[PDB]
Write a protein that binds this DNA or RNA. Structure first.
Length: 75
RNA sequence: CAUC
């Protein structure tokens, strides 16, 4: 819910489409942030990002820790 | 739905 950062750039460490989640390493802090499938903006569809992709996102405080939201391409 |  609470927004912790906007317009953050990061690289997908891994994203597993069977479990519907993965992690993004933030470029500004080098910390991993959790990314759930629901947090990825709209892309025969499978909501997902690829290992090694650079993405742009917001960081919010979730129940179990910091997580990415509004995940998109960097433009 | 927290390291596949």
């Amino acid at each position: 819910k609470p927004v912790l950062a906007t317009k953050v750039l990061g690289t997908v460490k891994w994203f597993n489409v069977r479990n519907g989640y993965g992690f993004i390493n933030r470029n500004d802090t080098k910390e991993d942030v959790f990314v759930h499938q629901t947090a990825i903006k709209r892309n025969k569809f499978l909501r997902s990002v690829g290992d090694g992709e650079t993405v742009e996102f917001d960081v919010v405080e979730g129940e179990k820790g910091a997580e990415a939201t509004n995940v998109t391409g960097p433009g």
